[PDB]
Amino acid sequence: HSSGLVPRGSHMEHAFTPLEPLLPTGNLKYCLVVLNQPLDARFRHLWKKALLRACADGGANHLYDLTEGERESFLPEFVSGDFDSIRPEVKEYYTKKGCDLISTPDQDHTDFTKCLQVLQRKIEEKELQVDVIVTLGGLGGRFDQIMASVNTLFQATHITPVPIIIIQKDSLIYLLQPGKHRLHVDTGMEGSWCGLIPVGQPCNQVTTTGLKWNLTNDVLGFGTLVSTSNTYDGSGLVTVETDHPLLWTMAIKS
Amino acid sequence: MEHAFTPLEPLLPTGNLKYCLVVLNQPLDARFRHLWKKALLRACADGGANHLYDLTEGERESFLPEFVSGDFDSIRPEVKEYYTKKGCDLISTPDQDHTDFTKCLQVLQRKIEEKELQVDVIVTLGGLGGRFDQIMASVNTLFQATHITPVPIIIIQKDSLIYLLQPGKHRLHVDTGMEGSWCGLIPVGQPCNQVTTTGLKWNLTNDVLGFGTLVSTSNTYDGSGLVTVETDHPLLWTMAIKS
Numbered sequence: 365h366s367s368g369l370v371p372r373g374s375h376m377e378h379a380f381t382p383l384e385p386l387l388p389t390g391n392l393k394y395c396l397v398v399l400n401q402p403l404d405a406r407f408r409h410l411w412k413k414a415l416l417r418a419c420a421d422g423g424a425n426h427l428y429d430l431t432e433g434e435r436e437s438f439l440p441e442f443v444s445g446d447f448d449s450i451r452p453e454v455k456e457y458y459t460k461k462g463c464d465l466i467s468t469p470d471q472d473h474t475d476f477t478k479c480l481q482v483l484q485r486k487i488e489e490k491e492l493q494v495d496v497i498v499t500l501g502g503l504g505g506r507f508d509q510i511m512a513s514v515n516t517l518f519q520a521t522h523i524t525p526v527p528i529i530i531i532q533k534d535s536l537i538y539l540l541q542p543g544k545h546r547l548h549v550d551t552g553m554e555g556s557w558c559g560l561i562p563v564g565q566p567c568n569q570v571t572t573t574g575l576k577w578n579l580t581n582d583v584l585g586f587g588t589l590v591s592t593s594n595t596y597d598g599s600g601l602v603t604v605e606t607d608h609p610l611l612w613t614m615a616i617k618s
Numbered sequence: 619m620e621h622a623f624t625p626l627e628p629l630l631p632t633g634n635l636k637y638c639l640v641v642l643n644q645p646l647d648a649r650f651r652h653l654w655k656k657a658l659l660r661a662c663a664d665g666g667a668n669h670l671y672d673l674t675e676g677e678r679e680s681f682l683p684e685f686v687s688g689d690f691d692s693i694r695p696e697v698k699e700y701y702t703k704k705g706c707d708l709i710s711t712p713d714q715d716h717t718d719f720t721k722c723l724q725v726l727q728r729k730i731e732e733k734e735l736q737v738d739v740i741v742t743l744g745g746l747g748g749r750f751d752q753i754m755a756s757v758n759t760l761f762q763a764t765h766i767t768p769v770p771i772i773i774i775q776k777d778s779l780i781y782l783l784q785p786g787k788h789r790l791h792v793d794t795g796m797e798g799s800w801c802g803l804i805p806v807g808q809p810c811n812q813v814t815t816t817g818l819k820w821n822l823t824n825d826v827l828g829f830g831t832l833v834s835t836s837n838t839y840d841g842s843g844l845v846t847v848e849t850d851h852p853l854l855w856t857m858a859i860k861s
């Protein structure tokens with residue numbers, strides 16, 4: 365047996381700062397995935413420091429259409445998806461510029477999901493160390509596609525170990541796996557609202573600290589209770605313990 | 619035994635469909651003018667009033683809602699004043715555990731009972747774009763609506779419609795001519811372990827639909843003009859609307 369002072373009774377929690385990638389400074393290691401939605405202005409800052417940048421289908425069009433005059437400074441490592449979704453001249457441009465154009469036929473999975481699978485393969489091949497995968501898009505447009513985006517977060521647990529967030533306009537979503545989470549919301553990029561959405565199944569035991577309306581061993585479920593328009597207590601930290609995957613959503617300032 | 623329904627019927631220029639119109643806090647789509655014209659009763663939920671007011675400048679008197687409900691901190695002062703002045707019924711719904719959309723449906727059900735109105739469906743405009751938490755709240759309102767009113771409720775914005783299918787069998791007529799190319803079945807809430815359909819390109823046969831298991835998106839029609847769905851738990855139907 366060991367002797368002397370020994371640590372006891374600790375447990376593991378998943379710490380994460382959702383909006384860290386939006387900060388000017390820092391040394392966060394992350395990849396960037398551009399989906400088929402109009403690009404927000406923040407894509408410029410995020411593009412610079414990303415370790416790997418990719419586009420899924422039509423995302424290449426949106427990237428191309430917002431980078432005229434400086435497209436050589438915005439060349440994705442790769443572009444994957446259905447190639448009928450990319451305009452002819454756009455595909456021609458990225459191809460000649462050396463971008464890896466990867467076809468992903470599979471009619472049972474979205475280009476987003478297929479794009480993550482390709483990204484994971486590249487992360488491994490290049491032995492990259494990634495703290496998060498930042499996805500731009502997916503939360504606007506066709507309602508079925510917004511839902512597909514959410515479902516991709518559920519499938520991702522089987523695609524990659526790296527945390528994945530999705531950001532579009534003023535919103536971010538991130539899927540909290542069963543367990544305890546420590547979310548730092550003190551970057552100063554945070555907006556005023558947040559929420560906890562029990563999308564796949566009711567979360568029968570949710571406990572939080574840091575919210576205006578906290579949950580204490582409470583049930584969150586559609587038709588029972590869903591936390592929307594929640595806000596922070598000002599502590600700069602939100603903790604969440606959930607028994608099933610629970611979708612965290614939060615506002616992005618401005 | 620089965621619930622027959624035609625989701626896009628209200629979008630048709632033709633028809634004698636009795637429906638109420640609810641305007642949520644989002645910019646209005648081109649289909650607004652026509653929907654307002656033939657609605658039996660129109661209402662605004664909070665900010666919805668701001669969008670209406672701004673959109674109808676110059677002809678506001680032709681677009682006066684029966685009532686406007688919600689937390690008054692969501693409606694601009696001048697907007698609230700205007701509708702009040704024109705005789706619009708302004709109802710305060712301050713409860714912070716419920717959204718203005720849900721509270722608006724409660725007022726609407728009261729009004730329908732009060733006036734003994736015969737309503738086939740409640741058409742909601744907005745709620746599917748913007749803040750992600752609010753899009754999910756819109757979905758949750760549909761779960762709650764089942765205990766608020768017996769009148770079917772659909773939500774429409776841009777090119778999408780959502781409609782919640784209660785446990786049981788449904789017959790959805792998708793031959794109005796207003797249908798877009800895609801549709802889906804989203805098991806928001808809980809997995810639906812026994813789903814059976816006809817009319818889709820990818821049908822389900824006593825199959826499981828659940829997030830992380832199988833979610834039907836980008837599904838399409840078989841061209842028969844009819845989609846039937848049997849489900850064990852509430853299942854969200856979503857469909858494209860022709861641009």
Ligand SMILES: Cc1ncc(C[n+]2csc(CCO)c2C)c(N)n1
Pocket residue numbers: 577578579590591592593594595713714715716717718
């Ligand atoms: C667990 C829980 N999360 C969030 C809210 C807040 N909320 C819910 S609906 C609404 C009004 C929207 O206009 C507000 C503020 C709550 N009460 N309980």
Ligand SMILES: Cc1ncc(C[n+]2csc(CCO)c2C)c(N)n1
Pocket residue numbers: 470471472473474475820821832833834835836837838
């Ligand atoms: C039950 C079921 N519903 C829909 C589809 C169709 N689908 C799903 S993802 C995708 C491509 C999206 O870009 C398509 C066409 C399916 N295969 N199975």
